[PDB]
Amino acid sequence: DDPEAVMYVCKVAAEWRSTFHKDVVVDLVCYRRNGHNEMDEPMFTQPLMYKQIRKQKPVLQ
Amino acid sequence: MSCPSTGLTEDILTHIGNVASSVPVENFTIHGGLSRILKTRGEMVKNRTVDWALAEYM
Structure with a gap:
């Protein structure tokens, strides 16, 4: 939800791969706005998570 | 060997x-x-008919 740290982490990982020639893992913690499919109802199993979701602004805004 | 009726x-x-x-x-x-x-x-159950989901319960 903070893009300016995502950019820095990606840059650092790209430098690490060139400097040490090892694997590196980058984990992006986010959420899923819709259901698993476009025609899907996610409220059947995760009611409160999606009640919280529909009160949150998109990152672009 | 024999099998009893399953009804x-x-x-x-x-x-x-x-x-x-x-x-x-x-x-x-x-x-x-x-x-x-x-x-x-309930609509189906009162009419004495089962769909696929009700047979698994029964």
Whole structure:
């Protein structure tokens, strides 16, 4: 939800791969706005998570 | 070797259907779309017909 740290982490990982020639893992913690499919109802199993979701602004805004 | 018949008497089937087409705890709220599904289950159960989901309960 903070893009300016995502950019820095990606840059650092790209430098690490060139400097040490090892694997590196980058984990992006986010959420899923819709259901698993476009025609899907996610409220059947995760009611409160999606009640919280529909009160949150998109990152672009 | 032989196998007994697997049928059941009707009252058992009706009791299972009635339990399967409802929510048997008090104070429990459920989604609208799920309420329609349970109501349709009752629709079928009162007409003496089973869909695929009701046979698994029975």
